[PDB]
Design a protein around this nucleic acid. Sequence first.
RNA 1: AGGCCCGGGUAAACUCUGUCGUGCUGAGGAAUCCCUAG
Lengths: 280, 151, 61, 126, 192, 215
Amino acid sequence: WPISHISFPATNDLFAVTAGPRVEIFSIRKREPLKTIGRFDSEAHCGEIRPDGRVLVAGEDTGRMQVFDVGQGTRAVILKTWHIHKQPVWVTKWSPTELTTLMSCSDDKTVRLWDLPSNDPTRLFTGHTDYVRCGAFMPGSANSNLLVSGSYDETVRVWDAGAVMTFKHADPIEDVLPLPSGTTLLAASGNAISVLDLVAAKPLRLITNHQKTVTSLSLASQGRRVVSGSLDGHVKVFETTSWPSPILSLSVITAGASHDDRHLAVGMQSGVLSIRTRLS
Amino acid sequence: WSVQTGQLLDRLSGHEGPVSSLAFAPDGSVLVSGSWDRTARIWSIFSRTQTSEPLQLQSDVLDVAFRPDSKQIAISTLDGQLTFWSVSEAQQVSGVDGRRDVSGGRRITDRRTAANVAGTKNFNTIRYSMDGTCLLAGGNSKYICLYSTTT
Amino acid sequence: APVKFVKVTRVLGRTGSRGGVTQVRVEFMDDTTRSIIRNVKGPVRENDILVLLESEREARR
Amino acid sequence: SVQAVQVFGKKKNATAVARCVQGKGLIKVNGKPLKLFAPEILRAKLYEPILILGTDKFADVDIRIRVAGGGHTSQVYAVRQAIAKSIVAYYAKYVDEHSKNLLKQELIQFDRSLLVADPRRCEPKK
Amino acid sequence: YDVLPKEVLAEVGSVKLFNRWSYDDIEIRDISLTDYIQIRAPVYIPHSAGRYAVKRFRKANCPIIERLTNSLMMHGRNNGKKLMAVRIVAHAFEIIHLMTDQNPIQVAVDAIVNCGPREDSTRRQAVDVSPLRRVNQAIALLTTGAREAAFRNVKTIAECLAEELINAAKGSSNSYAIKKKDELERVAKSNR
Amino acid sequence: HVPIPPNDKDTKRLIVVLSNASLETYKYTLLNSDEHIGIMRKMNRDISDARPDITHQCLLTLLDSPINKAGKLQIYIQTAKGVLIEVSPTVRIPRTFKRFAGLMVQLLHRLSIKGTNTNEKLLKVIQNPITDHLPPNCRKVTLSFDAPLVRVRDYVDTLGPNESICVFVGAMAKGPDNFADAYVDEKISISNYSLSASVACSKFCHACEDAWDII
RNA sequence: AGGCCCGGGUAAACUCUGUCGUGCUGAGGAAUCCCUAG
């Protein structure tokens, strides 16, 4: 069974999307599946509970994005549902600024910005090629908050809310995250991860350690070191200034308790999930 | 009775005891009965529904007085306690326990002490002032007792 | 169609006709002088703020 | 030679006794504690005199409630009436008389049904 | 503590409805409807033993969450059942606060103000509507929309009541009670 | 394909109400001008009214219209007995007036025609008035003669995609436009000459095929 | 005359928590009648 996502808010719940309709909510205290949730149609894509309370969103195979609350018991009450675009939604992400503001990056050429309690997308964005998979949220301490979207075989982009500072492509993009500085970003393609100074829309500098294709990228323990994870079956940690799991990996992300990291969560296409509270 | 006719207009029901203080409102829309059924009563006569609205009290109602604007009413009841009621939305707003405030003690032919006689510890009659701020209260006793309404 | 808030002074006892429709005396709220009488469905009393549309209505039953 | 107060409470048919004595904060309703009686959706109506009056008024007393008759709702109203009358009555007889009048003011400014139960008769209209 | 749980002792300060939501910063958006929609006296759960049918204009003094409960016990909720109605008010307010992250009682009060009609059609003549009738018709169209759209679907009266009360707070062209307000006002415009 | 359910109040739809119909089962058969000409003409009351071949051909033409093939039609019948009948888009009808006549007789008898295959009813006699069964986003209109000229495609062009329309078409005997004044928002005219209910419904429904793009 | 033994034919409600998920497993026309606080 494949594994496609693992995330957590910004709480004793580490949420794990395995690619089927069942998706497991974890206690980070006792490492166990706290609730096997999920009544999805065919294929639940990348889902994450929101960073205040526990309201989970995840997208389905056809395009039905569902958002539903969850507590401490068996409460899978479908809060509301979405069936606007009929092509597989790949990631849905919250906004750490506004509690009712979502993000869907589909298998379309379009990504779009949501508000919860309405039944219409509050902002729509076009421009990519098809299957633009990944995307994220640019935080701002005093600046405005921008949006990132990396595509299948195309570029990676950022825009305000039209202001698209699209970068470049040389390889299929599948692992993107911005730093907590809100000015620098990581766009990671198959042979090579790429660190991106976003200050003056400055170009890349390119780094390779994984021989085969990278799949997921996670920032790590102190907020400083950054662990990258491949389809080679190998992950490794990176610095902030200079920059082993038994089979091939997909969505390998650490899990932190309050600020101290607690356990590396390791997803793989075979089905096991190497979570490790014991590190070096 | 009716004055501009001369006959008896009604006799009205509701009480389980001898009604012992009657008061119309200075608006003249509401009669209020206070009776020894330990109860008071809003009598809404003048409209098409001659309706009642009881005020379940704790003891035998001795007196009833109106605020000179008809929005609030006070009853003396046989404990010695005064209490204050909204009239539009019938609801107690306040109340004094004045049992110790009124004790003019030890008549002769009292073999009981001055502060133990129940029988000087209640207000027969209450009034408001013309502003609507202070109450007079007084009973079978030696002290006339001047309260307020807001504080 | 601008909205004009409005309030009530008198309740017009013997006039009101055709059912539960209370006809009522109405003193305007922004300019606190102009007073027309309006037709009101439902329970209404003195000191009761009514919302009326276009005030070119001078009719009764 | 103890500081004991007996107090009743009423609804349709649910009658409740409550004995309030010099204690250390507990309220027990039919042996079980107060936060366990009266199925979950009405325990706020149980707690209403406590978080009107403040728990600092209750940290010196013990309230023991027996409830009989009625349905669930009427037992809840009988309990909360017995709570409120219990503390007003204990502060009547043992602590000073000013604090009674202040507690009566708080309870009456909230709802008089915490002190005087008004049972419904019927209305044979004229 | 005397005996109180950690949630109640945690919020012991002011008055919270369902021990979560205070009243102290909620506001009417109609001076006409202000003196009838009750946020004045504080009440913890809608269940209370008040006689608001002794004489007219008491139900302009009972709290309006108790009015939304009392309207939620109609023939679609089998008239004797009270605690069913305060339970649907509980799960509906939780669904409002999770869909919205706004104060759900402000969602309900701005819902009621935005739903009660202001002109109706004497059955033809067109009259202004009382504000007490505006509150009554507001609450009735809200719960009627909750049942009539939660009739045969999987979506419970909690979810559908929360959706009609949220969309009602927005004044959108999706809500049943907004559509009935615009239909009644549309008929009064067309008739006059 | 699924037609419009009663759950749906969102689709911009055409409700056609044939008002003041003549469905009166006498003696069992309906009141038609074929055989009751001796009792109407004998008992001297406004011959003029044994209608139902026009609501027959409105049911044939409207239930064979391509607006039924899109499913955006919903047709009601208001009779002189106060009976209001909900006619399905998915009901099929025999093409003959006699079987339609006895089928309306048993519709008035048991107040429901069930499907011979499906569980759900097809012809459902329902409550008065029509406003319990109309959508909230409604346009209560009426074809008329005293009304000025209103072009259909421009009119429903001025209707918005959330806003459904309920037309009032007169297959009546002989009467003015006060048959529906409790529920009229607008009365329109589409031509200067006299038009029947059949060609009126066909020009209106084909015109809103032209304005709703049903291909 | 009967009696035996063995077979055949202090509440509902309510609360709370968990498993399935509209699935002939469909609440009643015109009318006329009643009803205002336990």
